[PDB]
Symmetry: D2
Subunit: 103 residues, 4 copies
């Protein structure tokens, strides 16, 4: 009835901005998009703003495999975001990776 | 630099299974897919199993607009899942809707 | 076994460049992408270069409905491309619209 | 301004049915979908019926790379379709592969 795709990697990464930092956070995350979409192993890299918690900004991502996901995570702009940008703008966050279930 | 799409609706719905209920939960959620994909206003309806918390199963969804999302949520099989299936299989869950940010 | 989605609109539009005009054609078509992706009713707008006929450049598109497709086609940049750019760069072309079959 | 993704493979495959064979053709092509979507390297495999030429049925496809595309093309059901089904149902067809242009 269903089969788990054991190769492709899905990631959902949500970020809760600090008070007054939501526009800055959306801008910081959106700045990552053009180069990420140009990665050979990037399938999907979509940014989203919550209708329920307007401080929440979330990436919905897909990569051809875990090597491509790891390559993405080691990119300079991504590491700069985690190390330098995030501590100034974000209260809390959550990152989860997945395999897709095909039915 | 970016524009929020104010029409299309993104939804991320994550479900944490009870101990021993993960396979039953994946099956219950996967059973919803064929009819949902056949909804005129469904763009995306993808099921995913967590690599980090293997009891977690998550839908990543997109609909043409909020009317189409509301129509989906009122479907008999969806309401049956929430009302009848979920209480037996799920410890906790989270549903969040979003607008997509285009950069 | 399958259901045709009678609402959403798929379009495939292929363009065969004149000799020596392929890079100019890719550039002209790519210039349309950022504003099209920002259309409320645009789902997909992907540009592709043929591996089999390297003068061929093709858009693969999806819109929430025919009104959104018609809105896209009436945009100034799209009409400028058809009227002004295409006659200089393109030998021949084909545009086809579709409904998606869900199985 | 743009970058060609040299890894992922896009395919558009259109089939023009013989008179009276369109429903049979849609069914034959749709029968390929469930197993193809379950391929580890399949990203997209979408079937479409033409609004302009109702005998035309077209697949819009994407695979993680050329090895995954070649694997797909060598599958028993795909070869059975080409060799056994297509000659009975199809007047003419066209298959084109592409690399995606990211802008």
């Amino acid at each position: 009835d269903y089969k788990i795709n054991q190769q492709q990697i899905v990631c959902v990464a949500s970020f809760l901005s600090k008070e007054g930092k939501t526009e800055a956070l959306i801008a910081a995350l959106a700045s990552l998009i053009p180069d990420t979409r140009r990665e050979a192993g990037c399938i999907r890299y979509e940014l989203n703003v919550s209708r329920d918690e307007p401080r929440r900004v979330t990436f919905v991502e897909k990569f051809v495999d875990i090597a491509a996901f790891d390559e993405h995570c080691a990119k300079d702009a991504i590491q700069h975001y985690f190390h330098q940008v995030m501590p100034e703008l974000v209260e809390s966050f959550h990152v989860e990776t997945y395999h897709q279930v095909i039915a």
